[PDB]
């Protein structure tokens, strides 16, 4: 159904056959990043739920795999499994908690 990620398609009639018009989605402009498998926060390994960890040199974010949309790393979009001693390439970073600003207010 077309070269790329298939989106929608249309038929058209023709003599002795049919013609399809395949609408597809293709990525356009990419840029390099530095990535990590997990993040070690006070002895807990955090993995992304639906996404991938990225870095703009100094700060760490989590974003979609098919579109660059940075978000703050939070326990809402990450889940905890195991320790920091088994994952190869786990980095040290902090994980934001949503209850902290709403507990003091």
Partner 1 sequence: AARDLICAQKFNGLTVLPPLLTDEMIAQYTSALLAGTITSGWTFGAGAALQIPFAMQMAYRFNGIGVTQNVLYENQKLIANQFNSAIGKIQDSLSSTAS
Ligand X SMILES: *[C@@H]1O[C@H](CO)[C@@H](O[C@@H]2O[C@H](CO)[C@@H](O)[C@H](O)[C@H]2NC(C)=O)[C@H](O)[C@H]1NC(C)=O
Ligand Y SMILES: *[C@@H]1O[C@H](CO)[C@@H](O)[C@H](O)[C@H]1NC(C)=O
Residue of this chain nearest to ligand X (CB atom)? 58
DSSP-assigned letter for residue 96: B
Helices and strands: H and E segment counts in the chain:
1, 8
- Nearest approach in angstroms of CB 42 to ligand Y is 8
- Nearest approach in angstroms of CB 79 to partner 1 is 8
Binding-site size for ligand X (CB under 6 A) equals: 4
Using alpha carbons only, give the angle 94, 39, 47 rounded to the nearest 5 degrees: 120
CB 34 within 8 A of CB 63: no
Residue for token digits 């978000």? 71
CA–CA dist 42, 91 (Å, integer): 12
Residues in the chain, how many?
Answer: 105
Q: Which does 31 bind (CB under 5 to 8 A by kind): ligand Y, ligand X, partner 1, none?
A: ligand Y
Among 32, 58, 100, 105, binds ligand Y (CB under 6 A): 32
Among 24, 34, 56, 83, binds ligand X (CB under 6 A): 56
Q: Which does 92 bind (CB under 5 to 8 A by kind): ligand X, partner 1, ligand Y, none?
A: ligand Y
Binding site for ligand Y (CB under 6 A): 30-32, 40, 92
């Amino acid at each position: 159904c077309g070269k790329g990620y298939h989106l929608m398609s249309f038929p058209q009639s023709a003599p002795h056959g049919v013609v399809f018009l395949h609408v597809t989605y293709v990525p356009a402009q990419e840029k390099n990043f530095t990535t990590a498998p997990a993040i070690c926060h006070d002895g807990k390994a955090h993995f992304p739920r639906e996404g991938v960890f990225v870095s703009n040199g100094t700060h760490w974010f989590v974003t979609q795999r098919n579109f660059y949309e940075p978000q703050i790393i939070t326990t809402d979009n990450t889940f905890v499994s195991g320790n920091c001693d088994v994952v190869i390439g786990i980095v040290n970073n902090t994980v934001y908690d949503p209850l902290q600003p709403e507990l003091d207010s």
